[PDB]
């Protein structure tokens, strides 16, 4: 009896359950939202212990057939903490690796940006936004200079990619923090449940994107805070906002 458990983000867990209905065994798989790319291997109660890159070749009456991809890379559940971003910071995500890359942004003076490698349709998960997990209080109480990469996860958690992990040479396990801001974005941040990173956010397209198109997201800072306005945002953002409101076609 094969069970499939689908997450709202489109990913899924699949395998035969044990006597106790637990997703425990050596033939369990996490399947990415493309319904093709998979991490296949040892899981315990749905937690990835040793998953290897695989392809979902076909499914017959709910029964999946996977075949391992070449290579020796293995992945495991490795949730970040307040001060550990990953146990394998330089081990990239294979699904992300086939879809996006980091390069100089097309946006003037905006450092690096995130780009698509492929033509995909709307609502496509492209990249993952993993990071250390800290409190809103910590983030809200410190300088904007330390808040370039903070992204609200939920009511108790903010995800951050702090120095020195904001440099690909030090951290490339996920790349969501490299997407620059735009008031006319082609992507959005969305919830994601990842077998390695746990509950995080992802970057999902709003519409079809082409190969080599820069991926942008609206950062969503508060433009008019309740405690006397002037957007609670970095200067570059406030500047771009003025430039946006101007040039806007009404």
């Amino acid at each position: 009896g094969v069970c499939w458990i689908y997450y709202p983000d489109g990913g899924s867990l699949v395998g035969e359950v044990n006597e106790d209905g637990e997703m425990t065994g050596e033939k369990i798989a996490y399947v990415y939202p493309d319904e093709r790319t998979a991490l296949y291997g040892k899981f315990i109660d749905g937690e990835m212990i040793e998953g290897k890159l695989a392809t979902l070749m076909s499914t017959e009456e709910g029964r999946p057939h996977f075949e391992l991809m070449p290579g020796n890379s293995v992945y495991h559940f490795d949730k970040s903490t307040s001060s550990c971003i990953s146990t394998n910071a330089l081990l990239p995500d294979p699904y992300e690796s086939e879809r996006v890359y980091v390069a100089e942004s097309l946006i003037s003076s905006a450092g690096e940006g995130l780009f698509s490698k492929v033509a995909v349709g709307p609502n496509t998960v492209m990249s993952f936004y993993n990071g250390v997990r800290i409190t809103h209080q910590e983030v809200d109480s410190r300088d904007w200079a330390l808040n370039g990469n903070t992204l609200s996860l939920d009511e108790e958690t903010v995800i951050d990619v702090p120095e020195p992990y904001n440099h690909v040479s030090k951290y490339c396990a996920s790349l969501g923090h490299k997407a620059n801001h735009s008031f006319t974005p082609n992507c959005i941040y969305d919830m994601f449940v990842h077998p390695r990173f746990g509950p995080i956010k992802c970057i999902r397209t709003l519409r079809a994107v082409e190969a080599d198109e820069e991926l942008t997201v609206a950062y969503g800072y508060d433009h008019s805070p309740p405690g006397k306005s002037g957007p609670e945002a970095p200067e570059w953002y406030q500047v771009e906002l003025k430039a946006f409101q101007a040039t806007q076609q009404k």
Binding site: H136, V139, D140, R142, W144, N147, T150, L151, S152, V158, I188, Y189, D190, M191, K201, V217, Y219, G220, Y221, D222, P225, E232
Partner: peptide, 6 residues
């Protein structure tokens, strides 16, 4: 506040 909001 000082963090992107999905």
């Amino acid at each position: 506040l000082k963090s992107k909001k999905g």
